[PDB]
Amino acid sequence: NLYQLWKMILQETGKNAAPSYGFYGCNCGVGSRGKPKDATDRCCFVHKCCYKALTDCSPKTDSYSYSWKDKTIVCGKNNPCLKQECECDKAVAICLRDNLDTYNKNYKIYPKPLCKKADDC
Known part of the structure; x- marks a missing residue:
């Protein structure tokens, strides 16, 4: 779910995901994909493409289990759709x-509306 995504981002980057990445570039956070403004933005393009594989689960509201080891993310025991979701968020x-x-x-x-239209996943 969103809580897990946000927690991972805080864990891995040291920043609060809402203010730092919720409106960043053409792809991070709210809105659709767009041609990426940089490398940070590109991570978010790939992530939204990764979410396209979630046929039977909602990345926003469906909780998966994962662990945060010594600085390491490990996706837990989950059903196949939640497995994919966790691995999307991890990446x-x-x-x-x-x-x-x-x-x-x-x-x-x-200003996401001004973005170049996104390539095909």
Whole structure:
């Protein structure tokens, strides 16, 4: 669910996901995909594409189980759709964390409607 996604992002990046990534670039947080403004944004493009595989579960409201080991995310015992979902969230939290020397506070709150239309997943 959203709570788990947000917790992972906080755990991996050290930032609160709502203010820091809820409106970032053309892809992070609210709204649809768009042509990515940078690497942080790209993590979010891939993540929204990853959510396209969730045929029988809602990434927003369906809870999955995962553990947060010594700085490590491990997706738990889940049904197949929730497995996919957790792995989507895990990959975005690790991806965001990974490009943190490129995060652009200018993109934090982006005029998403002006974005170039997104390529096909």
